[PDB]
Amino acid sequence: MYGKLLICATASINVININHYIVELKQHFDEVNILFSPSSKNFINTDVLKLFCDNLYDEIKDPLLNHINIVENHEYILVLPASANTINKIANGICDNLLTTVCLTGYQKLFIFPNMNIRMWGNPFLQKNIDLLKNNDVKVYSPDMNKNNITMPNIENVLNFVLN
Amino acid sequence: MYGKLLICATASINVININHYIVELKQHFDEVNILFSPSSKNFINTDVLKLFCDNLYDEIKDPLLNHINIVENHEYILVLPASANTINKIANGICDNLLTTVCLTGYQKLFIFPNMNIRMWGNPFLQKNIDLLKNNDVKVYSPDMNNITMPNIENVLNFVLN
Amino acid sequence: MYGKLLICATASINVININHYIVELKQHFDEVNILFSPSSKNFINTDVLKLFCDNLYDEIKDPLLNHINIVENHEYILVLPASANTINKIANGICDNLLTTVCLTGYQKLFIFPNMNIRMWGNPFLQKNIDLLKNNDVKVYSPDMNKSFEISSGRYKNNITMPNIENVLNFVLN
Amino acid sequence: MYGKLLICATASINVININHYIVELKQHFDEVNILFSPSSKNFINTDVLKLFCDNLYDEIKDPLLNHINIVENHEYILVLPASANTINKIANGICDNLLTTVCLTGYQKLFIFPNMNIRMWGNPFLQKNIDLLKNNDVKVYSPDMNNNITMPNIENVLNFVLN
Amino acid sequence: MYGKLLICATASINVININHYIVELKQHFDEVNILFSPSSKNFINTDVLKLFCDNLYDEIKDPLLNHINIVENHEYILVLPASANTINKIANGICDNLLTTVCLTGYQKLFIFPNMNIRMWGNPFLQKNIDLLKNNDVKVYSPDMNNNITMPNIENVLNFVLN
Amino acid sequence: MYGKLLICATASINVININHYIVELKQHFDEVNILFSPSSKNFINTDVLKLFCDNLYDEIKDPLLNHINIVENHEYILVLPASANTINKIANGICDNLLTTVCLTGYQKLFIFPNMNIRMWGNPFLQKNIDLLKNNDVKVYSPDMNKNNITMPNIENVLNFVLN
Amino acid sequence: MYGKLLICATASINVININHYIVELKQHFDEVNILFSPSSKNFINTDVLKLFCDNLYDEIKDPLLNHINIVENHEYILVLPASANTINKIANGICDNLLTTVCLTGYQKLFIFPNMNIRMWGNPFLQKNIDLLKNNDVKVYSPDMNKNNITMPNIENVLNFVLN
Amino acid sequence: MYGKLLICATASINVININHYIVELKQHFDEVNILFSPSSKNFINTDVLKLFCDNLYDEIKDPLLNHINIVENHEYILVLPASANTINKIANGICDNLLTTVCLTGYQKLFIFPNMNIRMWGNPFLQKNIDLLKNNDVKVYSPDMNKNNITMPNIENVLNFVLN
Amino acid sequence: MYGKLLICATASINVININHYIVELKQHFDEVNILFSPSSKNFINTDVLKLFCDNLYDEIKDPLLNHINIVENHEYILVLPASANTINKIANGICDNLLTTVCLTGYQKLFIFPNMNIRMWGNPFLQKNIDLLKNNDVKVYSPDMNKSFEISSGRYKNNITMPNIENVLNFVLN
Amino acid sequence: MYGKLLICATASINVININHYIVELKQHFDEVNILFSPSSKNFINTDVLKLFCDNLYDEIKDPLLNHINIVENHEYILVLPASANTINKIANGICDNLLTTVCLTGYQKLFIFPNMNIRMWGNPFLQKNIDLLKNNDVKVYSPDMNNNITMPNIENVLNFVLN
Amino acid sequence: MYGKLLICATASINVININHYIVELKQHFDEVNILFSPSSKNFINTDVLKLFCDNLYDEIKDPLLNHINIVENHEYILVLPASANTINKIANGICDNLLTTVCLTGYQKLFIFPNMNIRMWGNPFLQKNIDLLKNNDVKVYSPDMNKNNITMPNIENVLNFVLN
Amino acid sequence: MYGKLLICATASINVININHYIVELKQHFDEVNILFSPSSKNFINTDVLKLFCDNLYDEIKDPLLNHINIVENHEYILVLPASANTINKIANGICDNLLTTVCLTGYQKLFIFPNMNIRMWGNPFLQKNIDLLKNNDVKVYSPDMNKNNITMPNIENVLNFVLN
């Protein structure tokens, strides 16, 4: 196994299927923990993930969580699914919630998997920020567009983009 | 009439007069719907707008509103009044609330009407973002004037159509 | 004394020691008032500062506070401690809370004192924003640094430390 | 300027435009303060009026407000917009909220500007009360019409109050 | 069928049996909708009436309900049971809640069915108001008795409204 | 002693002294019970009166209190102190709270002691109503005046206005 | 009169008319008290029954009510209206609320008046339980098939089933 | 398409994957609506299902939902996943919540898909109830045992069983 | 010591004395943990048991407690005191709360100690269920009974009583 | 059988066994009533005791209970178990809850049964206060030990209170 | 006239009449301010006092009040009515609420008017504490007695005791 | 290092600087844990101390905390800052909260560091209690004095006083 991995889930419709990635990834990484964005809590009951993840970081239960330790405790940090909003915040250094604060601190171990409707993907400001992220050592995976649509990355494809 | 128009209202002091624009615009567009920023709810009772608008999009009443459909359902999207904050968020692609998420998705049908005190208008970062928006096909209206005042119906009508 | 000074405190761990700066600064400025970021309220009981400051601006107690008047009422506006988050928001003109709205309006009287862990300080996007702020007349102090032991790595690392009273007055008045 | 003026706003749909009257009236009266009926708070955020008015009397924030002092502090008291409900309460001396208690105490400085749908205006009991008010020195403006009644033109309220 | 009918129920002990009238009246009128007074909600669970009525107007669920439309949407408006309090409010044009505001607006289509203890019925002020209502085209049914007053027969309720 | 007496207190600044009338009245009547208007609560803590009166009738504690029984239970019903608002309500038959409903039903046993600022007392509408009350046999006491302002009645004067 | 009678009302639509039975039964039994199932409180304001009943047993107001005393205090215990749910719980000895605990304890004085839509009445499991109840000395009344259709036990009917 | 289908989901760990069945079933039935057990709400945010289902029946939002109409409005009623608890309640006619009340009323259109740990599956009382259900026309899918424990019925399995 | 033992306490009046059994049983079993029925919380403050028990399973504090693990973690599961309601639920496989779900899963390690007024004990449906439980390998102890005087009257009546600690030890270890 | 007895229970761990004393003492005193310290509610559900006691005084249910009458209805007032804290409060006349107010008032018929860990018992101030209590007519019982410290045997408490 | 005076009112039943002192005292002292003990709130609505006093100090409204400044702002601190509990707290230095913290700080300007039932007045501990207080420059009034029970001090007497 | 040390912090204005003492003391004692008085929670967010202390004893989070174990687990117990109120409570054996109960139990390991305004320090009752504490083996550090006001303990002096 490759070491501790942290999943930073955002308010993308596909966050409802995040449990599938967890059990799958639990086979390749020592640990697979998770952290959600405030808005993603409107899509699922995050406490359920405690049944699949090694650890769940909840900023509501604990408002004084140490983001620095969280970053040092992991070798890989994935933002999956990654919303246009969080992508753009990270690109501009905006860290107004735990997830986003963790992503600023650990930009060097960051892997972003964009997920959104195709029309949002065409936004000029989003794209400009994606270029900015790439030109600064932040790994941004290119969305799997199959309809013109846009699907969620294959569990194999995520492994390649991170380890390879 | 020209088709469905959506008003994205932000926390500007003039949002308290947004009802006047609605009834006026209802005469030129098939429909005139409205969507507010969370903060603008501290200035007015948004439910009242249900009495003038065809539809009110409330993200609190319905947290799973489809922003894509909202955008496809309109030919024009105005951010009136437009706060410095929202202008700057849109310019940077930040969409942390429904209104702002709708503006990212529909940048091609977007018309911005800035409203703020003159001193805020002079902010370097705001201005840099306004240039960015204009150089990217987002229509941004030049604030009237001593202080900035709301746009005249005559003007919004021209700007949104020309 | 030099005139009214406003402190804009953000959610930095050192906001718990902000009271020390207040009493100290009260000796050089006619008034020293304070305004906190929503998140900083998770670190301290902000009402206590009413005992040291001349005025406390609370956007929860009063959601319709006039930020323009707040800015005109002060000659100096310090963001101390200044979080990476607020620095980056100011740099991009994002003003989604009172503190941050006050900073947009008063960019000409703004003095920023960064405070964060050294690793956050190395963020490319933060640094790019800091340059942007400086190249636009916003005074951004260079975070003081000192040798400190880090139990994590079991090694001495250079850590970012909080401004010195002399160093804050000097940076502000000079 | 003519002296302190108090606006007593009621739950009429037009209370959403009361801010326009304030800024306008601020030019003719030393002060223009406001007081709302409990129900009118379902139409607007009354705190916003603090930005236009000199003073806002809020009975929820302060349940022990002195209505007598409020009345002595003003030379003119306008109920604008005036709902059928408040008009009828005043006519019968019913004062179950601050606004309505202020109107009982200051009947001598009272100016009423009715606003309601035309059908409500035709109510026999309302009309009987309006006559009662007029025959007792309470100034009641005649709803501008054109059939439907509309809000008081600002030069008209000014004329009705001063002249 | 004769058209849409609205029942305005008030805080009378017999409001607990209002469901019986609904199902019965549903056979003679296109629609039979209902609106309650705030106080009547202390006697029954008003949501249950949604199971018998075509529509339930709830001012708490929707504070901005259009009373004018409610009145235009009905040919008959019954206040059943009608409390002394509401009768007296209507007589004086007091409309401080939706039900009572609907009754002011639709005085021309109003039918009142008083229900209260016999001693309350003897109140001078109530009686004076009842006369006032009758002398102004408001139909006020004469309570059935036997000495104590009882509720309206379903046969008798129909006569009063339909002719 | 005389029969049971009920005090109906309204939102008059003097409802804060109401406890004084109770102990004194308590020496002449079998029972002296009390009932308040909802607005009275903003002046005093009505529960303390439980310590002086034989019975406190609270509509919030018990929303379905039987108002006919309360009237049948007393020989004298005193609305003391009486606000302009309750006086005008009773006069028009408005009975929208328990106190005002008890007064509609017991008009034949009702005694009113007005208390309010001298300026409120000059209102034409209230006066028309006071006349209406008296002309319908509801005893309304003539407010005491002392140089000109109205003052509360002495226990001796209420005793006299109620028994004789 | 025949002695104290307790009505155990359940979440049947007809519980909204339970007040009619009370006043009627008050003429044949020394006392007629009532106890509701938690769910029936979604159909009516149970406090109103205090105006017709001698006593109302409320397990929310008093969580430590003595069910044994309640049973000893009555000669007859009627479950009216009786829901399919409560019938089936009683048949299986399930007593997870006060009403149902009272019915287990007083099976010997129990009279059940079923009320439900005709389709629910045809349930195999319900019927099997009804047989079980009858073969164990629990009186179960046979509903009114009139409009198939279901109806409530006429006062005479309930009266005659209980005194018989 | 075969007509309206209702899914009654219970507090089984697999209820977190119920969304997958919905989208799949939406292709064979005119409508696919859903109703949850109170306890299942501790596993997921049920409001999200509004995005996949035609209708969501929520007894908290509406305590007076007509279970009879719900049953008449559907040709098929599946309890998927079906907990040991709900299976046993249905078998005994216990209907103390909306889902369970709907299952009593519509026993003739009921299809049960058991899901639980293998050890719970071996319970004597559960098994006795399963036999009872089967011998009374209630279709109870017979779960598959693999590796050793019960596995959740495949979408193909539910389709074949429901449409057989 | 014989291994981990779990006590499933129900809403019986005697649950107020459950602490006595705990300390006593702690001497014969490696661990003695406890789990309460929702209704039993109206009789006592369950948190107090944390002072005598090794572990307290609280489904309110943690709605996603693993009942399977709870069962595997114990060699003996006692329902003490056992109410008529829970006995009848277990007999019918009804598991609508944690305690009752634990009892379904661990029917093979289950020991029931009935406690209720004598009149409830005579219920036909309860008795039929007790037979069902016994004929299915669930150990159900025969309630103790002595002749106690009452004040509810002047008569002496037969009454069921709580099991002596020697009684539950013998019923559980044979 | 002797007069009415009142138990004043405090936040001692042993308050969880107070129900046992109740039924035992019930057979000797006309009435055995109870009152608890606020902190006591963290150990037991104080309402269950209504099932064993004649009366239960609860200051939250009724914040205006007459402690004078409470002391008069009883001939014996026991503070059992007696915590160090209440023992010290009583000794210094501190009465900030219903229980200690009752104790300040009924000091002449008060009997204290200390129950605490052996280490708290050796505290200088606690002992000093116990001396002051004994030197002022308050019966303070001598805790049973075995070196631990246990609760009052039923016979023991009767001896101390009656004899 | 005389300087600022402060009334520290405690939970004595006579606190319901403290309003009568205020008006009278306001004629001899520049300002007459007040602050109550938490328990006092159970007897009266302290908000009304704002209608009579110059300033009311509320520790619930503002938990960070400056007691030093308060003691510093007044020339006379009266605890009226003074309860047993407070008298003893002050004697032992206990200062667990605002009132009591103000009394410890301004013991040099303290005037105490005991009010309680005659039986409590006889408490040994209370009386010894009063001896202790009087020996430390704290003035404690000896309660008037009539009828036998203690009664509240009249103005002439609080005026005398305080101004001598 | 000298062993486990417990800090008992009270509602003194300087409790806002207690974090400084913690980090400093963490270098001389194996562990440095903390316990706050209910009132001190109005000055700071006590949860933050979890970031500097080894353990935080919170009586609200856990109402049944074992004070005896807390005392046995520490070699030194400091009340820093020590309010006049707590000092006086300890002196009289009053233990109405966890902190104060811990101080009664561990009087032999107790070290008190007074902090209050100079005027409060002059209170006769406080001083009498301080003498009482000293004459009973409770170490009471003499407040550092520097204009004339009292100031907080130099970490060097707290060490001397506690270690000698």
Ligand SMILES: Cc1cc2nc3c(=O)[nH]c(=O)nc-3n(C[C@H](O)[C@H](O)[C@H](O)COP(=O)(O)O)c2cc1C
């Ligand atoms: C959306 C809406 C608009 C209304 N407009 C009017 C109006 O113009 N005039 C009026 O007299 N009443 C109007 N009503 C009815 C009043 O709000 C209602 O009678 C109320 O009880 C009056 O209370 P007030 O006298 O305290 O303001 C309206 C109600 C609603 C919900």
Ligand SMILES: Cc1cc2nc3c(=O)[nH]c(=O)nc-3n(C[C@H](O)[C@H](O)[C@H](O)COP(=O)(O)O)c2cc1C
């Ligand atoms: C802002 C403020 C600061 C205070 N400072 C002190 C202080 O330095 N010393 C002190 O003994 N009391 C001080 N007090 C008073 C105490 O907080 C008060 O006596 C309290 O009841 C003590 O409670 P404790 O012993 O549980 O901490 C202060 C009060 C406030 C509101």
